[PDB]
Structure formats: C-alpha cells, structure tokens
Write a protein that binds this ligand. Structure first.
Ligand code: SF4
Lengths: 83, 461, 202, 61, 117
C-alpha cells in the first residue's frame, strides 16, 4: 500500500507524456486554424484527421497516441501503490 | 512608539487565563454529507479512459432543449413587440422580414490564442510551425449558427456581454438592412433547481496555491504561520478560532515542472506538505484537492492525489475509517457542508478561458473581468466552456458531468491572481462566487461563514 | 562504514564550500540561489552556486577528498588574496579518525544543521569582503601518502575508474604548513561521523 | 517546374509550400474531404474544405 | 517557571545553534500560547548578554499578521491588537526548520472527531 519511489516515478513519466500529448494537440489545433477559422470543438475534430506525412508533428502525434493507448497495466488502481 | 514600548505594553499585561490545556476547546463540527451517499459525478475510471464529438453533440442537444424551454416560457405566443407581433423561427435562414423573430442557436466567435501561449507550445514541440502566420494570413463579429447557417449579431445589447464560442442563446432581434441580425434580448438556459438554504454554526478556511518548492524558503514560513494561526496559537481568541470547522486546500500544493524533475525533490516537497498535514490534523480537519501543477492528471476532472505521495506518519489517517478529518477529494466537487452545497474548482476552466484573446467585448485581466467570466460560466450552466483545453477524452458517456444539473450555494474558483466576491441573481436564485488568490504570493486566507455566507480575508506577511 | 557516510559527507562538504564561497564574496551573490536539492537532499536552504564550471569543480574536488578520506585527517578551504598570494582566512575542518570503518538520517541532518548554523553565525560577523580579485584555495593534511608519483609507469588506462584514479593522484602538489586568531565552532557528534570545526583569521 | 528549379525531397504541395513559402498546410485524405463536403450540418467543415482548396489554388501563384 | 525555559532557550540558542520559537516552549513545557509569549518576553528582558535577533510579529485589526523587519516604522500602531515575540534567531537569515511534532497533550483546540485506529 505504501510506495513513494517507483509509483512517483511512474506518475512523473505519465504526466510528462500527457503534457507532451496536450502540447502536440494544441499545436495541431492552432495549425488547423488556417482552414477552419474556429477555436472551439470540431476544430480539434477536424485537426485530428490531418495525415500530412510531410510534417514532423504528425509522426510524434501518432507515437504519442500509441503510447497513451498502451501500458494499461501501469495505469490502473494498482500502480505499484496497491491503491 | 518604538518596538520595545509595544512589547512592554502588550506582554507585561498578559492575561494567561483560560489556557487550561487539560480541557481544550472542541472545534465546531462541520460534516461533509457527500462523503458516503452515492455517485460522485467527477469520479472517473482512469483505466477505462475523437471522443470530443459525442460530448459536443450531447452539450448541443441539452443546451438547445433548455434554451428552447426558457424561450417558450418567456417568448410564449402572443408576446407582441411595440409595433408588431414577435414570430418564432426554427432555422436561421427563416429570419428574413420586417418583423421581430427569435431563434435558438450557438455562438461563433474568433477566440485566437495569446502570443505567450503560442511561443510556449512552439518551443515545446520540436517542429512546430510559425503558428502566428495562421492568425495573420487571414475577424471581429459575433454570429449565430443553428445547423442551417450563420447571421451577424449586430446591435448594442450583443456587445455589452461576454461570450465564448459554442454557447447557445435565445437571440430575439430584427433584420434591418442585410443578412445581419439585430439583438434586443437574450435568453439563457432555464433556471436549474437549488437546494433550500438551511436555517451553532461555524466557518471554513479556503486556501489555494501553496506552491511548496525547493527553491523558495519564504513559502514555508507563511505555511507555518498559517498552521499556528488555525490551531489558536497566534490569535489567542479561542472563542472565534474554534469556529473554523474545516480547511480546504483548493489546489497547487507543490510547484514544479514535469519537463525536468525527478522523484527526489518532489518527495522533499511532499514530505514538507506531509509534515504540515501531520502537525495540523490533530486540531482541524483538512480536505485536499488537486491543482493544475500538482502530481495529478492534467485534465480538469482530476482524481484524488493518491494514498501514497505522503509520509508514512499519516498511515493512520488513510486506513479508511478516518475520512472526516482528512479527505482526498476530486478536483471538482460539491461539498455539502451542513447543507450549504458549495461547488469548488481548482481554477483551470477560467485560466483556460483567459489564455485566449477574443477580438470582441470591447463595446483587461481585471478582477471584475474574471468575476464576470465566472458569472457567465454559472449562467451558461457549463463549468468548462472551452472543452478542448480543459476536458479530456471520455469525460462521460451520454451524461456529461460538467453540464450543471443543479446550482450550488457557493461557487469557488481558486488559483486566481486577485481576490473578489460577488453574489449574482439568476432566475430568482442567488449564487455567491468567490475568487481565491494564490497563497505563494499575497498569502491571504478566506474565511467563509455558513450562517450568512460572508467571506473575510486574513493576510499573512 | 562507507555505506551511507559517503553521501552525508558529500552533502556536508558541498554545503560547507558553498557557504564559504557565498558569505565571503568569492563569487557574485547573484549566481547563488537558496535551494534544498542539488542532486542530494540538503539539510537546510543552503545558497548553492549555479555556474556550470564551478559546480563540476566543486564536485570533483569533493570526490577527490572523499577518495583520499582514509588518509586525510584535516581539510582546509584557504581564502587567499589576489594582489598578493597570502592566506587572509582559513576554515579548517578536522577529521580526527572520523570514526570511520572499524543510522537515522534525520539525526545526521540535525547535526549538520547545527554545524552549518554555527558556521553561518560565525561568517555573518566578519567584515564585508570586496569583490574583484578575492579568491580561494584548498589544502589537505594527510597522514601517510605520496601524490604525483603514479605516472611513472605510463599507466595505460582501461576504464574510467583508473583514469579517475590517475587524474586524482596527479591533481595535488606538495606544500608546507604572526597574529593568528583561532575560533572553534560546533562540529558533528553523531556516532559514525565525529567531525570538528575551526577557523583562522588575520 | 519546382523539380527543375529547387532540389528537395518529396515535391508535394505541402512540402513545396513549407520549403519555399515557409507555410505548413494540413493534409486531409480524399475520404475526409468527401465526408466534410457531404455534411448537411457543421458549416465549419464546408468552410474548411473551401479554404483548403482556396489556399491550394492561391499557393500555386 | 522562568528557570527551565531560560535554560532551554539558552541551550537551543547557543549550544545547539537553532532558531527557537515560542511553540517550541509550548511543546517542551506543556503550557498555553499566552504563557509561552510571556516567557519569551521575560527572556527578552534581563538580557545583558544579547547575542540574538528577536523576531517580532504583531496582529492588527481586520485579521492581519505581519513580521516586523524595520522596527522603526510600524504601520497603523493604533490598529494593533497584539504584538509578541515569535522567535529568537542567532543568525541573520531566519529560515527555520519544521519537523514532526507529537501534539498529544499540548493542544488548545481539538477537532470534533477522534482518530479511529
Ligand atoms: S500535424 Fe502538422 S499538419 Fe497536421 S496539424 Fe499539426 S501541424 Fe498542421
């Protein structure tokens, strides 16, 4: 129940990855403003379908998506802290 | 008078009475009725975890239904204007004629980003384009979309009101000389139910933005003075200090950057916070809430911190049975403090709205502007108007938690630059909004009463 | 016992050198910032310099001293003037048997806190030292060793440990030992670490 | 003409726009553009495809 | 008692060089906060050998708490409802240290709930 080193390291890794993903999503949402001229919802939806293989932000985006959609064993009620 | 004269005047005439230390004054009891009842709305499953489109559709449908109810209640058939009768229109292309007409539709604004946010996201992406070009290559107008087009909301009533894109309204205006709709009155969603105000009673302490870091040593002395003040050591007026039934840290307990951080210094700050908690718990109850820069999820519905992340000296409080004295709570929560339903948010919704620059509302980062933003958040019945910035994938399915289903008595948005309170009257009801400032800089502590809802501040220098 | 003492002694020496460099104006005070973490949990909010070269210099010096610890019984940070090479201040840190190889870290940090508080209280009473050609030095007093005589075999290195041993044996030169004013301070009386403090002026 | 003048890798409209004009354009598949152009709702999608092709035609000049 | 307190303060100020607070006297002598302030002021008196820096804080009206630094221009001396000595600092930089305290019987205010073990 008590573990403050490995669990906190896992939290640091997960939070770093989540902040990187949010930054990438914000960058794509700002880049998609050229066409949509919108800022609310459906702008992130229109920007989520950009498959421009000539942009380095796209490969990083799909890598972040693959990383977030995996490693479900660490992201659970038992993250080496048992609760 | 000199400093020695003040000491000679005060300490020589010390009372040293009523300090028995054998029969200490019992703190006033303040309970949280939402501790065991059921269904915490903001408690999600992190293991379960674009999904934003379903939330968009649900918000649109619910808000349109509510605004249509309010309109049919206020713009009921027969409500004639000064000259002619007011008509009802289903689509935005049907409002065309020299006659009044009202319709329901969302709001479309510009909402461009601020330069500092763009610079940050560019410097933290490794390949971000010149995002400023997207705003300069392409302006200032509010429009109304209702699934069938848009019209320009011209006039004066539309300018003296803050708006955010996506919000639906019940515009009632008149087409004048082009495809530009005037505005005479605006409708908001129908008023929500509110629990009756209860009819001996104590107060609660509101603290936010401790920001315990490993570089600033001043933020620990203010915290120690706060620890000594709540225990009744500094003020010595146990007849009034014993009325602070609970303590509510509203987020931002530790300040760090997850870009460059390890487990050691975060553990140092967490042990400092745990020392504070262990020293203050035998005298007062604590309700800890996650923040924007704490070791928790970056989204808005942040789960409680952990049973870990605290020193092993607090293992007796986390055994499960001791929850009334220490309660790790979700980031948004509705505390039912002796019937006074208070909705508390760490303050990311307003801080995410303020990171935009809307080229409207002209006809600047002040306390009144943020209070107006909170009042509009309460008016629109949506805690997070900017969903893509605050919300995360899968907040809920078919029943969104941020769409308010019940108005609270006190609405707290913390981690704000300034402090300010405002009571607003929305459809015969009354909600008291409170803006809690950070404790790192301008270390004020808000004392909120529960018998009359009067907030007073306590500064610590 | 060389198990945990090597970290606590490193932290103590880091705080010692940083406090001496800060309170004597050996480096500009703007390059210092009060902190608690410098890759090690510090016992106080110690002003630690954040210069890239100075940090590495201090770390290498402390590692060399800790390597030679088994024969060193005294460590001094001498403050020499620059207009003329003369020791105007000397802060001696005695290591009399150090209760070395032959423990509730909180107590160790409490003793270090007391020692550093004594050092700060002593340093805060000295007159202000002008910048612009004030500097410092480092002198140790060993029991039985001879440095600088390891490069007499061409010592073809195989890894980083041997290279470090060579460059630490070669980084020291020999030296020798009026109105002196000795002022004793508070040391560390914890079991494994029995340290004593001194000071010299004029 | 761009292949003969400048020496870059892909020679697409987005790559040329970024390497010559320093403009980063999003790219949507032919099915996404079709789904946007057939959306009875979401005027944002129609504006999106219109500005998409308008920028593609303006960058050619 | 004015005898145990003086010895404890002298020890924790000169032998174990550390800033001593009045809450330390509360925890060591099992006394109230007002009596601790009285003892701190009494130790501030009879101080022919003064080798410390007193840290004085004062509580104004409207519930404000300040730490006096200049000791020459005290703002709003008429609104002061209390002014006592907070700590004795031997050094210049205050920067105290806070550790775990077992407040088993030194509490003047207890919460309505009891710890369930
Ligand atoms: S990925 Fe490259 S192209 Fe697709 S949006 Fe983000 S920036 Fe624009």
């Amino acid at each position: 129940e008590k573990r403050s080193t490995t669990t906190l390291s896992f939290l640091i890794k997960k939070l770093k990855r989540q902040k990187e993903y949010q930054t990438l999503k914000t960058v794509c949402r700002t880049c998609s403003y050229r066409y949509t001229s919108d800022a609310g919802i459906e702008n992130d939806h229109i920007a989520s379908k950009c498959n421009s293989y000539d942009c380095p932000v796209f490969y990083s985006r799909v890598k972040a998506e693959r990383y977030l959609r995996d490693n479900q064993s660490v992201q659970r009620e038992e993250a080496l802290i048992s609760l | 008078l000199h400093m020695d004269a003040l000491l000679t005047k005060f300490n020589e005439d010390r009372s040293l009475q009523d300090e028995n230390l054998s029969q200490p004054r019992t703190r006033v009891r303040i309970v949280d009725d939402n501790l065991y009842n059921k269904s915490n709305p903001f408690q999600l499953c992190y293991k379960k975890r674009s999904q934003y489109y379903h939330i968009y559709q649900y918000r649109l449908k619910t808000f349109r239904e509510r605004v249509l109810k309010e309109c049919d209640k206020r713009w009921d058939a027969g409500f004639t204007l000064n000259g002619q009768l007011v008509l009802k229109k289903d689509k935005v292309l049907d409002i065309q004629g020299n006659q009044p007409c009202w319709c329901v539709g969302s709001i479309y604004c510009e909402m461009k980003y601020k330069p500092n946010v763009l610079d940050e996201v560019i410097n933290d992406t490794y390949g971000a384009p010149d995002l400023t070009k997207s705003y300069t290559d392409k302006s200032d107008e509010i429009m109304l979309e209702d699934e069938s087009g848009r019209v320009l909301l011209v006039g004066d009533f539309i300018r003296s009101t803050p708006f955010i894109t996506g919000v639906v309204v019940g515009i009632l205006g008149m087409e004048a000389e082009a495809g530009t709709f005037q505005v005479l009155d605006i409708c908001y969603p129908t008023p929500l139910p509110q629990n009756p105000f209860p009819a001996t009673r104590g107060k609660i302490a509101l603290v936010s933005g401790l920001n315990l870091n490993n570089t600033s040593p001043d933020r620990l002395l203010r915290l120690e003075i706060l620890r000594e003040f709540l225990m009744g050591r500094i003020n010595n007026k146990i007849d009034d200090i014993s009325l602070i039934g609970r303590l509510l840290i509203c987020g931002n307990s530790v300040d760090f950057d997850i870009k460059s951080v390890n487990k050691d210094e975060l553990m140092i700050s967490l042990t400092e916070f745990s020392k504070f908690l262990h020293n203050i718990l035998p005298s007062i109850s604590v309700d800890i809430m996650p923040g924007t820069n704490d070791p928790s999820d970056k989204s808005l519905p942040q789960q409680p911190f952990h049973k870990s992340l605290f020193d092993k000296s607090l293992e007796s409080y986390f055994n499960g049975s001791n929850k009334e004295i220490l309660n790790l709570v979700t980031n948004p929560y509705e505390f039912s403090y002796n019937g006074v339903d208070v909705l508390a948010v760490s303050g990311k919704n307003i801080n995410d709205i303020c990171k935009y620059v809307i080229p409207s509302n002209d006809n600047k980062d002040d306390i009144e502007h943020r209070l107006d933003l909170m009042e509009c958040t309460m008016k629109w019945q949506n805690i997070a108007p900017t969903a893509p910035d605050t919300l995360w994938c899968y907040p809920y399915t078919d029943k969104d938690p941020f769409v308010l289903d019940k108005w609270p008595h006190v609405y707290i948005v913390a981690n704000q630059p300034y402090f300010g309170t405002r009571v607003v009257e929305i459809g015969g009801k009354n909600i008291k909004i409170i803006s809690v400032p950070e404790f790192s800089s301008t270390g004020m502590i808000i004392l909120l009463d529960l018998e009359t809802l009067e907030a007073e501040t306590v500064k610590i220098d | 016992m060389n198990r945990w003492v090597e970290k606590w002694l490193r932290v103590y020496l880091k705080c010692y050198i940083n406090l001496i460099l800060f309170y004597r104006n050996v480096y500009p005070p703007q390059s210092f910032d009060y902190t608690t973490y410098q890759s090690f949990n510090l016992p106080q909010f110690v002003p630690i310099n954040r210069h890239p070269a100075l940090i590495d210099y201090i770390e290498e010096l402390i590692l060399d001293v800790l390597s030679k610890l088994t024969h060193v019984y005294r460590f001094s940070i001498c403050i020499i003037n620059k207009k003329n090479d003369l020791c105007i201040e000397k802060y001696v840190l005695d290591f009399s048997e150090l209760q070395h190889v032959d423990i509730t870290e909180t107590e160790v940090f409490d003793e270090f806190r007391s020692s550093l508080n004594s050092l700060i209280m002593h340093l805060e009473k000295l007159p202000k030292v002008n910048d612009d050609t004030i500097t410092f030095e480092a002198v140790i007093n060993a029991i039985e060793l001879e440095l600088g005589h390891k490069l007499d075999r061409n010592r073809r290195v195989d890894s980083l440990e041997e290279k470090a041993e060579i460059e630490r044996d070669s980084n020291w030169v020999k030296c020798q030992e009026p109105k002196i004013k000795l002022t004793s301070l508070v040391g560390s009386d914890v079991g494994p670490l029995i340290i004593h403090q001194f000071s010299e002026k004029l | 003409a761009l292949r003969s003048d400048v020496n870059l890798t892909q020679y697409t409209i987005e790559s040329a726009a970024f390497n010559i004009l320093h403009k980063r354009l999003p790219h949507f598949s032919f099915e996404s553009l079709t789904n946007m152009w057939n959306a009875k709702k979401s005027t944002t999608e129609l504006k999106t495809v219109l500005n998409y092709w308008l920028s593609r035609a303006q960058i050619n000049i | 008692m004015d005898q145990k307190a003086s010895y404890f303060i002298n020890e924790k100020l000169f032998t174990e060089v550390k800033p001593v607070l009045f809450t330390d006297l509360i925890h060591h002598l099992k006394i109230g906060p007002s009596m601790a302030k009285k003892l701190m002021f009494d130790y501030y008196k009879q101080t022919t050998n003064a080798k410390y820096n007193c840290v004085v804080i004062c509580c104004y009206k409207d519930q404000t708490i300040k730490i006096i630094h200049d000791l020459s221009n005290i703002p709003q001396q008429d609104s002061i409802i209390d002014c006592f000595i907070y700590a004795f600092n031997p050094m210049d930089s205050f920067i105290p240290y806070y550790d775990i305290i077992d407040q088993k019987d030194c509490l003047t205010i207890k919460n309505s709930y009891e710890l369930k073990v």
